[PDB]
Amino acid sequence: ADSRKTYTLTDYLKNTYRLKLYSLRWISDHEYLYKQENNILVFNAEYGNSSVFLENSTFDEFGHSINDYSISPDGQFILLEYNYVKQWRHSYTASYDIYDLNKRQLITEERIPNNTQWVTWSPVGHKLAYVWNNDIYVKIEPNLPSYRITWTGKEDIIYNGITDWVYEEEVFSAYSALWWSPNGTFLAYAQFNDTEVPLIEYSFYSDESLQYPKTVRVPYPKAGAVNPTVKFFVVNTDSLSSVTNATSIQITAPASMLIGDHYLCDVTWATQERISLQWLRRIQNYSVMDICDYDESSGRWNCLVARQHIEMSTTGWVGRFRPSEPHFTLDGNSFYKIISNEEGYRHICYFQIDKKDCTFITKGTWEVIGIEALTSDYLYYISNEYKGMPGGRNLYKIQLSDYTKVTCLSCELNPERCQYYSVSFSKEAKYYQLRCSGPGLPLYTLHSSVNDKGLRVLEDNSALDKMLQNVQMPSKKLDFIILNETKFWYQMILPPHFDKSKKYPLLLDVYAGPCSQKADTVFRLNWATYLASTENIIVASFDGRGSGYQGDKIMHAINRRLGTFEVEDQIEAARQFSKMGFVDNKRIAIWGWSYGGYVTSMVLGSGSGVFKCGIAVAPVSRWEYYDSVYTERYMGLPTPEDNLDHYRNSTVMSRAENFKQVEYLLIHGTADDNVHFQQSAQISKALVDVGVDFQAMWYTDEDHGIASSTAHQHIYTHMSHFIKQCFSLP
Amino acid sequence: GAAALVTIITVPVVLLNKGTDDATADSRKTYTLTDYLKNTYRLKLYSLRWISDHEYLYKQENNILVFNAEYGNSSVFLENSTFDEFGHSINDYSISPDGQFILLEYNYVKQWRHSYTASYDIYDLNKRQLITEERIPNNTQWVTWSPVGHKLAYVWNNDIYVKIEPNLPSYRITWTGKEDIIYNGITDWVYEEEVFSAYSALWWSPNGTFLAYAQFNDTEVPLIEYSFYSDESLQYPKTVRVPYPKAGAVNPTVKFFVVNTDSLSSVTNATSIQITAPASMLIGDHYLCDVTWATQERISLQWLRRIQNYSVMDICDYDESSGRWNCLVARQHIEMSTTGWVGRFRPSEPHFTLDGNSFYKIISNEEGYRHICYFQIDKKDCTFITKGTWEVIGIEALTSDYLYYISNEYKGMPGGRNLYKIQLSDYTKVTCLSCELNPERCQYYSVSFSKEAKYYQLRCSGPGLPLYTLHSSVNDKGLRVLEDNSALDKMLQNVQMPSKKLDFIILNETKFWYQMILPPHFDKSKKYPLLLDVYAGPCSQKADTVFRLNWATYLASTENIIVASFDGRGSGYQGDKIMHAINRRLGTFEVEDQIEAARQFSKMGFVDNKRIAIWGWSYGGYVTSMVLGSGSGVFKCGIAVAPVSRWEYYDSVYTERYMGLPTPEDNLDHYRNSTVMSRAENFKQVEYLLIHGTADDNVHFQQSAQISKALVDVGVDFQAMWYTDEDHGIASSTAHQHIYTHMSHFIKQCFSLP
């Protein structure tokens, strides 16, 4: 028997073994900013030598705690975020202090206002664009009076320059609607109108001191509810006048998008006077990307119907979540974007503003994960082609002049330790930092694009290795199970000292979200590590119909059929795992979060009998309750004419009776902005009405993530007890 | 054994078997949780409505029947088929005093404990037809017949309307009606759940000439906000806002009014004279405790200041010339309590004599025990007509020759209740009316007299099966038995029902009573797991002689768990000394005694020390949480259902009455030293199950949420369960069954039961 310690839940809850990382900020095509011992340091990318940029002492007397720093492209001033207060996933409010780096002084005039919602440095220069009270303001110079752009900003009504809840969590996936022109002359902002959007009302219990609970209302368009109205405007920052209100040029949306509900999915600056706006109709199966240019005579941005590019998908939704960002060339008369080929595998395609033909430069059964950098000679991109593994990531470069000349830059660096390579290029793609998150310890290495040569290893996580060498860390097994001749991959965190002769319990961690991957090669220290190392449980995950990075066919398989194919596949995988031999048929469990929790609820209510017990955290019960953008993209409109029937059938409440055959633990946070507590409330009510005896746990004032240190520890501690009790483990 | 003995061995085997049988041969069924949830064994009841001095109405086979008490015969007042063609299920019926009309309630909707809304249809008994004209409006909040005659006054949209004749149009009285702002004729949440303890602020005059109404103002009262999930169809949850004055928050404004119904005309509006509170009450926030009509021209109002330790009763007489009711300062009776709060829960209702120049009322004596006091309207002297170490539970009847009251004097048992009558002319002449009726089966008695108290139904609650008997006051003669629960008795013979023991332990030379539901086949030698059911509310009695078939019965009969309840400092019907002991110190002495109670029970000899638990609701949940957080170590686990945490969260009227004001100058220290959240660290040593209904209106979910958050912060692993869209009662059939099912599971797991 090994005397090494197991990875205990304490190690997971109280991060003991930490995975070191090297995060740097490229400031130029030869230098980056890496913070060490509270000191920003400038490391010459090629030489490797380090020069102190800002000593801790500089901000030791700041009097506040700088949550995050921001360096101007010119580096003449630095933004300091203090009084940080987080709202939703990306939305946050904090105070900003602009510290001059030339006279080494803190600007004390016309300072950024308190509770600023978003501030951004100019692309090139030291200009700023802070958003305050749902309003956009532009400061030509950090020490100059601010110039106000918008004037109609209203809280929870008119969002100017900042995305609303739905857009922040689904569309732009950020809290920034400000887009500066490449040189900083033009600022492009978006006005989101939520006047009609209905409000979700949940109660916040604040602290013990609070006497009456605060009721919080958020503009949240539930499936079928009126979506927010989006308008796009462009303002000339250089022409900003303190005497007169700045004039904003509102660019109209594509005519096709003006016949119904429209969504501005992405805004990309092509040139100094060319901008590309990608829009998508209410039904997410029709997208038009406009390439509007800027006229000088009328000083009015104009859209050309000839340049418009229309992408429609009958198989399913257009774009995994939204049309990808087009990486335009320097001239701006040609752009490269990831599109799905007729076969159904998304690949890179070369387009020209005048041309209307897609010239795909990549082809195969693999799929282009993303474009990294475009530099005349080669276009760099990450793909899952290596070893035909959908759960692998590798950097590739393709000569633009000769597309046939494609070169992998990471596939043969360290095959055993690194297979999920990810990269961040420099300002001019001269030096790129390649990092691998699996299957071995995270490794961070710099490179030189000129000769594809490894400059040096920034981080090797060696300190974690020796420590891990003293722990029975559970092994990870990633393979595939052929189902209906459709290869589906699965991963298994086999317990340490695994022996297929013996029989082990199996917990199927599940998510099965549209376009999701739970069978990657990433190395992670999570609760699964504890369950496998200490509780000796085979934690496993499966990617069936609905899995992403495997082609449109599999991804669009659950189109207009949510909680159907994916649920059956997960149960099928459990059967496949059970007959593999090592899995104990009697002790099989499933646990999931959000969509995973919805799947967990569905599989427990399936009545298959394969699963014995299950835990669902903040699970979606009725798709009608969920937001419109997500549900509509994978279900449609909840209207009798459209897919209303599927919405009604796909409700956890329907399978309530079957739950009597299994143990269900329903955990949900009272203050859940995303999956509202309403979902779990209806689940509990249904189970209570039918009489299903189930355990539950509400976390007061906890978000969808339930990440608050205390709640995080308690939720996993309680979950540990449930799994151990159900699996009859000591 | 295994010797020469062969058939003799089989013979000894036989003997052994016989012996075993003598020790154990039980084959009866046990009272299972199924029996409790599905009410397999139901207790019958005979609740009659005395409609006259000689006749009453009782419902048999859905048929309203009139019964002559003296003769004992009966006649069909209304056939069940009579309303089969109504088209709606009549929830309840109200017969006009004249017996010429009846109100049919349909579309019944419930709000809080008493508040409700329903549609009413008047039925002409004389013409055997339903009144179709001027029908009572839908959603009417309250409707009441005049004391005599057939006048109808109802509250609709927070406005009081009066119908002189059922067939005639309604005459609107108040026009200031508004929702959650101005409540006219109806009581706001605070008063409904605390002061008046009802949803009726209307008071008909004795002959119906006047109508007394109250205008509650909640414009400043802060609103509690809880979300309602309704049904699956509802897409966006509805946030419900209820006027709830938390401890220290702005309390509602109360104004009293009286209107001459006889002068009501459709030509103009009807003016209402306002009876202002006495200056003493006006100095600060005041509460109209109760309104009692004395004579046709005399009314009595009880007002109590926010600090509940100073109350004044205003006897107000109407002046014909002025047309305005006036109050003589001398007639006012002031009641102040330095030791604690005035009244058990509020100033008691006075019983005025027919003449109206004298009245009897329940006042605590100098010793500290509440007793009847004869009060003359023109005197300030309180002459106590009764006295002793007992207490007058309540007055039920006031005949010109005798006063009838229920007391706990019999056998000096604070729980026992018996009917006593006292000669008005000779207070020394007091005769018990039920003490020696059936002491073996009945020790807890309640009574309902007729219009002239000629006949009275003495209903019994235990310790035996509920027994309902009618008696004649003329010579204290028992007319007959109405309900004997004989059928229930026969069925109960089959099951091994658990027994009940009510005794008292001596703490600091003071007698504190306790009750134990001993399991069937109880053996003092054997030790049983003990669950301390507890409420320990101020002026509350958990130990009594009432027969009840509840969850505890299943716990004792099937799980063989002794269920015990103890009444310590703060118990009711035991004297002011014990009741006012926790004054301005809630969650202190009461918690310690319950802990001490378990300690005494453990050393009794039949309680397993390793397996002792506790459960409670509301204040009981607060005590359950406190004893678990007391770090005593006496209890192993506990279940808290809708428990109160920080006392500031609870309503002001209740908390302020005992704890006081949550202000730095007052008891704010204890307000922040009696929070359950404070003892979170100690909870780690015990097990905990926090259950609370999401839409609870009394104990708000916020209180439970704070407890849960605190436990998570400290690191206590506790099970929990939120019942969605459930009130404090959580009595919805589904929830009721589910809550006890889950609770049973936890108890068995904690007590390691097989």
Ligand SMILES: *[C@@H]1O[C@H](CO)[C@@H](O[C@@H]2O[C@H](CO)[C@@H](O[C@@H]3O[C@H](CO)[C@@H](O)[C@H](O)[C@@H]3O)[C@H](O)[C@H]2NC(C)=O)[C@H](O)[C@H]1NC(C)=O
């Ligand atoms: C965000 O969207 C809402 C809803 O479309 C906009 O509200 C609209 O505001 C205009 C202002 O002129 C209203 O027009 C006028 O409304 C009045 C009645 O309020 C009517 O009498 C006039 O004939 C005229 O229609 C419009 O009705 C109103 N729509 C509503 C309330 O549904 C709001 O202005 C938008 N905000 C921005 C900054 O775009």
Ligand SMILES: *[C@@H]1O[C@H](CO)[C@@H](O[C@@H]2O[C@H](CO)[C@@H](O[C@@H]3O[C@H](CO)[C@@H](O)[C@H](O)[C@@H]3O)[C@H](O)[C@H]2NC(C)=O)[C@H](O)[C@H]1NC(C)=O
């Ligand atoms: C229930 O209580 C509220 C709060 O006391 C009452 O509202 C109050 O009504 C009086 C009416 O005279 C208001 O006084 C007047 O206010 C106006 C300005 O609003 C001022 O111009 C007049 O000179 C006079 O002072 C008082 O301000 C107002 N208080 C508020 C709104 O907070 C309400 O009338 C009560 N309802 C009933 C039926 O008793």
Ligand SMILES: *[C@@H]1O[C@H](CO)[C@@H](O[C@@H]2O[C@H](CO)[C@@H](O)[C@H](O)[C@H]2NC(C)=O)[C@H](O)[C@H]1NC(C)=O
């Ligand atoms: C690393 O060392 C090189 C020299 O080997 C530095 O390059 C010189 O930096 C000085 C800074 O004042 C310049 O004046 C020289 O012109 C640079 N020489 C060349 C050839 O570029 C480099 O700056 C050092 N990097 C850091 C971060 O200290």
Ligand SMILES: *[C@@H]1O[C@H](CO)[C@@H](O[C@@H]2O[C@H](CO)[C@@H](O)[C@H](O)[C@H]2NC(C)=O)[C@H](O)[C@H]1NC(C)=O
């Ligand atoms: C820029 O726009 C703002 C907002 O419309 C103007 O501020 C308003 O000015 C008028 C002048 O009569 C006031 O009545 C309003 O109350 C002001 N605020 C709002 C919210 O309307 C401002 O004057 C404009 N500046 C210029 C130069 O036109």
Ligand SMILES: *[C@@H]1O[C@H](CO)[C@@H](O[C@@H]2O[C@H](CO)[C@@H](O)[C@H](O)[C@H]2NC(C)=O)[C@H](O)[C@H]1NC(C)=O
């Ligand atoms: C940044 O880019 C913008 C867009 O091209 C420039 O704006 C135009 O620049 C051209 C060339 O200087 C002028 O002829 C136009 O009149 C400009 N238009 C406007 C509306 O100003 C801008 O000059 C560029 N800025 C810099 C510093 O190069």
Ligand SMILES: *[C@@H]1O[C@H](CO)[C@@H](O[C@@H]2O[C@H](CO)[C@@H](O)[C@H](O)[C@H]2NC(C)=O)[C@H](O)[C@H]1NC(C)=O
């Ligand atoms: C986008 O999806 C909608 C909804 O499915 C499509 O509208 C339907 O189209 C089908 C034919 O393909 C008709 O039979 C339906 O009646 C249409 N409406 C509904 C309510 O389903 C729409 O055609 C799709 N657009 C594209 C470009 O494929």
Ligand SMILES: *[C@@H]1O[C@H](CO)[C@@H](O[C@@H]2O[C@H](CO)[C@@H](O)[C@H](O)[C@H]2NC(C)=O)[C@H](O)[C@H]1NC(C)=O
């Ligand atoms: C209305 O009352 C009559 C009178 O009792 C009920 O009829 C009785 O029904 C029971 C059960 O079927 C029989 O045992 C009795 O013999 C019936 N009595 C007579 C005289 O018919 C009748 O069921 C009641 N109806 C409703 C709607 O409750």
Ligand SMILES: *[C@@H]1O[C@H](CO)[C@@H](O[C@@H]2O[C@H](CO)[C@@H](O)[C@H](O)[C@H]2NC(C)=O)[C@H](O)[C@H]1NC(C)=O
């Ligand atoms: C019980 O029986 C008595 C008679 O023994 C009833 O009393 C009489 O009832 C008749 C009915 O027509 C009346 O005319 C008499 O005036 C009654 N006499 C008295 C003294 O009241 C009595 O009504 C019966 N009770 C019931 C409920 O049926």
Ligand SMILES: *[C@@H]1O[C@H](CO)[C@@H](O[C@@H]2O[C@H](CO)[C@@H](O)[C@H](O)[C@H]2NC(C)=O)[C@H](O)[C@H]1NC(C)=O
């Ligand atoms: C009784 O009082 C009500 C309320 O004041 C009167 O109804 C109002 O009459 C005024 C007359 O100007 C109207 O402006 C209001 O709209 C009426 N309604 C309300 C709710 O205020 C009613 O007329 C009075 N009746 C008589 C006969 O005096």
Ligand SMILES: *[C@@H]1O[C@H](CO)[C@@H](O[C@@H]2O[C@H](CO)[C@@H](O)[C@H](O)[C@H]2NC(C)=O)[C@H](O)[C@H]1NC(C)=O
């Ligand atoms: C109900 O009681 C009221 C109050 O005593 C009676 O009203 C008085 O009746 C007497 C005798 O008729 C008159 O002298 C008074 O002037 C009345 N007072 C008022 C305010 O009207 C009323 O008459 C009684 N009703 C009945 C039917 O007895």
Ligand SMILES: *[C@@H]1O[C@H](CO)[C@@H](O[C@@H]2O[C@H](CO)[C@@H](O)[C@H](O)[C@H]2NC(C)=O)[C@H](O)[C@H]1NC(C)=O
């Ligand atoms: C009712 O209770 C209040 C609050 O306890 C009493 O007010 C206190 O009175 C005492 C003297 O009796 C003072 O020492 C305190 O300072 C007062 N205030 C507080 C905050 O305790 C009031 O006297 C009581 N009234 C009666 C009639 O007993």
Ligand SMILES: *[C@@H]1O[C@H](CO)[C@@H](O)[C@H](O)[C@H]1NC(C)=O
């Ligand atoms: C501040 O920077 C200096 C640089 O030499 C380093 O030695 C010191 O430890 C730093 N202090 C903190 C608190 O990081």
Ligand SMILES: *[C@@H]1O[C@H](CO)[C@@H](O)[C@H](O)[C@H]1NC(C)=O
């Ligand atoms: C923000 O508020 C704090 C507290 O009042 C103040 O000290 C600080 O100077 C404010 N900052 C600005 C930029 O107004």
Ligand SMILES: *[C@@H]1O[C@H](CO)[C@@H](O)[C@H](O)[C@H]1NC(C)=O
């Ligand atoms: C109550 O509602 C019913 C059904 O709409 C209607 O027939 C009836 O007249 C209403 N009653 C009154 C008095 O409003």
